[PDB]
Structure 1
Amino acid sequence: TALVCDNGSGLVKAGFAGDDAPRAVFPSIVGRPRHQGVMVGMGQKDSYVGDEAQSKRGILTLKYPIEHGIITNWDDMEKIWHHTFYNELRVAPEEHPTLLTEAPLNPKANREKMTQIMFETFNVPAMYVAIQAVLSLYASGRTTGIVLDSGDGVTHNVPIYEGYALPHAIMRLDLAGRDLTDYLMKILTERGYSFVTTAEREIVRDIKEKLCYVALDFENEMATAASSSSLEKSYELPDGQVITIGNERFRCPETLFQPSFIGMESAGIHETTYNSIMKCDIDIRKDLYANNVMSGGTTMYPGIADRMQKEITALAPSTMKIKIIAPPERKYSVWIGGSILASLSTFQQMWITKQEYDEAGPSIVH
């Protein structure tokens, strides 16, 4: 049984092949103590991984091994992979052909190091690395293209025509969920609330998921928010305090369409989708326009499809049909597509085997 391990910047998605939902969806954080231990009872583990770090985040400094789709701390990454295999999956790595998903345009050394560590430290019989965006289209049962994948670290829109991922027409935007969390932390100081440490970042992140939404008309929404109190909501802090946010609800997600809110000179998600499509062939443009796929966890805000539909229609020939696909399972679409691909019997011929890694160069995966 293959293991489809889709590891991202924010969340780690792992589970057996042939299922429909990852078994272990836990944060990708490694925390270490920052205080002085007084009690001698219990060893007081020097490093917590996953939900253990989240529960004890008060006395820990949370760290992210992956920075924007790029692995930074290899030692922390090895700990997380060890935690997923033993503590979460409870299955040995040497008895399963694991499948991994890496971000598009990954450095060759990054992929070789991942393959080398997996084959040696975990002794996996075989492994294959697939593109995150392609699997999202696979889970949707399409081969059209323009798959907008926005997560915690990066935001990509990879076009895949007839199973062929067009490499030149791949646009990348650095703005993602983590930057939206930082933006909300900065503009939450207007009402007096102050969040600074890494533990507060998780608290603010939960606020953004529960309350923040997307407004199709920013100017009209701003006027109504400043003229009425209907938009204001409440959220109880872990220590019992009650906070109230008004126009901050529909302002934080607005950074996706207007990256200038966080000092970014790039284009929005709607403009970077339009630019990517026209870079493809003329015949493909009609195919991409009718079948546009929204994936990732960042695109889970209410009304995101309606705003995106209105935006793309503005930069449209006004005669083609613009349709956006937003499946309800878009948060786990990358893993669901990977699970389907692994379950395919025809796909079982494609696996980078161990002796091909050793008897040949480590670049055999490429």
Structure 2
Amino acid sequence: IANQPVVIDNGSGVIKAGFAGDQIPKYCFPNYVGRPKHVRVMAGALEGDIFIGPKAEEHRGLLSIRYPMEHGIVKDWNDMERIWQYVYSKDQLQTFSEEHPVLLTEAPLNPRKNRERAAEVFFETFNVPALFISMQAVLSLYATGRTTGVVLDSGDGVTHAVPIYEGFAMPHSIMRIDIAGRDVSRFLRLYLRKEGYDFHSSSEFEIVKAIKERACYLSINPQKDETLETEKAQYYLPDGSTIEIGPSRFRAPELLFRPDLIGEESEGIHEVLVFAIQKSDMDLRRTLFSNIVLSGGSTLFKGFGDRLLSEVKKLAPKDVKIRISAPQERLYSTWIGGSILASLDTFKKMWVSKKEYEEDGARSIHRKTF
């Protein structure tokens, strides 16, 4: 039957969820499963083995965090099943899995097997009435109130650029590169090892994520700023320690614009955006340059878009008006857009029937993938 549908954004690091017709995701919690790595002696301790949810951040000094989704592709399927059940848990949604149409998102160009296996989970473990899997870009266009644009996002693990012109998506112009937030944080962790801090545990890694979200900032000209010393921010650990970052506060998010630093022949995020535009036709290049829509949490770096303008302006043709729109709700654009598309009747004319899935299987979702 069709009750109020549920939108779930499988952000490779932060999963965002809520019902359709809403206006904000009230269920935002990081994506992992934390199991304890210590010994239990005192009866009356914490509860349960796995610790998905806010309890993880509340007791991170005990857990051994494991990420289920690496680069948008799920590795530990059992963890994603536990996370999805936690989304339907009594602390997050309280509904039953056999009650709502599910609007699952997905990073573009993910392997076929990922969609297939997600279908198996949602129609065998959960017995959902309906399911639809879509691109993350289209949703951001819904949440940004537009129809034409190039959604250049940066989730926690996959950055990509999808150029959509007047609601028509151009698949051959999609550029995907697997270097996002986790790689920025991982590279920053390596820099702190060279600064003498040796963060190597799992909880230490999420402390690095907190640093990346708070102390880093992007460059404008990394040589102008490389020849001069900087602020050297003093971040305080929860323990009470004191860490200094130095020039790595701007060298850490340089990995996005240049994967040569991490030792990887790939393209910058600017090259992804510019190529994604240029892989398309010629009559549309000017309009796509005039409508660049960001989303994704790894575009929230301070001083990011200004460097993006200097970069694309350095690459795009002469005097073309490059116009980047970056809203405040970039972190939830895919969720808000999922709510917008799921709050329609075309959505009823757009999902995949449970019966039809049982009759067909993988071929059903690969036909209705767009």
**Structures share fold, TM-score greater than 0.5:** yes
Query: In the alignment, what sits opposite 1:210?
Result: 214
Question: Secondary structure of the equivalent of 2:182?
Answer: helix
Question: Secondary structure of the equivalent of 1:93?
Answer: coil
Question: Take 2:193 and 2:353, find their aligned partners in 1: how far apart are those partners?
Answer: 53
Within 5 Å, give how 1:217-232 maps onto structure 2: 217-225=221-229, 231-232=231-232
Question: Secondary structure of the equivalent of 1:188?
Answer: helix
Query: In the alignment, what sits opposite 1:304?
Result: 304
- TM-score of the aligned structures, taking structure 2 as reference length: 0.94
Question: Secondary structure of the equivalent of 1:157?
Answer: strand
Query: In the alignment, what sits opposite 1:119?
Result: 123
Question: Take 2:63 and 2:347, find their aligned partners in 1: how far apart are those partners?
Answer: 43
* Higher helix proportion (structure 1 or 2): 1
Query: In the alignment, what sits opposite 2:354?
Result: 354
Give, as a single letter, the amino acid of the residue that structure 2 aligns with 1:103. Answer: A
The answer as to 2:238 corresponding to 1:238 is yes
Question: Take 1:42 and 1:180, find their aligned partners in 2: how far apart are those partners?
Answer: 36
Query: In the alignment, what sits opposite 1:101?
Result: 105
Query: In the alignment, what sits opposite 1:154?
Result: 158
Query: In the alignment, what sits opposite 1:197?
Result: 201
Deviation at 1:42, TM superposition (A): 5.0
Question: Take 2:130 and 2:186, find their aligned partners in 1: how far apart are those partners?
Answer: 39
Question: Take 1:123 and 1:174, find their aligned partners in 2: how far apart are those partners?
Answer: 32
The answer as to 2:254 corresponding to 1:251 is no
Deviation at 1:129, TM superposition (A): 0.8
Give, as a single letter, the amino acid of the residue that structure 1 aligns with 2:262. Answer: I
CA contact (8 A) 2:220 2:306 kept: yes
Query: In the alignment, what sits opposite 1:277?
Result: 277
Deviation at 1:43, TM superposition (A): 7.5
CA contact (8 A) 2:109 2:176 kept: no
Question: Take 2:288 and 2:46, find their aligned partners in 1: how far apart are those partners?
Answer: 56
Within 5 Å, give how 1:135-150 maps onto structure 2: 135-150=139-154
Query: In the alignment, what sits opposite 2:83?
Result: 80
Question: Take 1:20 and 1:181, find their aligned partners in 2: how far apart are those partners?
Answer: 30
CA deviations on 1:42-74 (whole Å, 9 max, x unpaired) are 585222212222322222210011111001111
Query: In the alignment, what sits opposite 2:32?
Result: 29
Structure 2: unaligned runs, 5 residues or longer: none
Structure-2 change in CA distance of 1:108 and 1:254 (3 Å):
closer
Query: In the alignment, what sits opposite 2:295?
Result: 295
Question: Take 2:250 and 2:361, find their aligned partners in 1: how far apart are those partners?
Answer: 51
Deviation at 1:39, TM superposition (A): 2.4
Structure-2 change in CA distance of 1:90 and 1:275 (3 Å):
same
Question: Take 2:29 and 2:187, find their aligned partners in 1: how far apart are those partners?
Answer: 23
Deviation at 1:309, TM superposition (A): 0.7
Question: Take 1:209 and 1:16, find their aligned partners in 2: how far apart are those partners?
Answer: 27
Question: Take 1:245 and 1:358, find their aligned partners in 2: how far apart are those partners?
Answer: 54
Query: In the alignment, what sits opposite 1:339?
Result: 339
Give the stretch that moved more between structures: 113-122 or 321-330.
113-122
Give the stretch that moved more between structures: 191-200 or 41-50.
41-50
Question: Take 1:43 and 1:183, find their aligned partners in 2: how far apart are those partners?
Answer: 33
Question: Secondary structure of the equivalent of 1:15?
Answer: strand
Question: Secondary structure of the equivalent of 1:22?
Answer: coil
Deviation at 1:12, TM superposition (A): 0.7
CA deviations on 1:197-234 (whole Å, 9 max, x unpaired) are 11100111101111111121211112232xxx5x2221
Deviation at 1:245, TM superposition (A): 2.0
Question: Secondary structure of the equivalent of 1:88?
Answer: coil
Structure 1: unaligned runs, 5 residues or longer: none
Question: Take 1:47 and 1:358, find their aligned partners in 2: how far apart are those partners?
Answer: 31
- TM-score of the aligned structures, taking structure 1 as reference length: 0.95
Number of residues paired by the alignment? Answer: 362
* RMSD of equivalent CA atoms: 1.5
Query: In the alignment, what sits opposite 2:180?
Result: 176
Question: Secondary structure of the equivalent of 2:348?
Answer: helix
Give, as a single letter, the amino acid of the residue that structure 2 aligns with 1:201. Answer: F
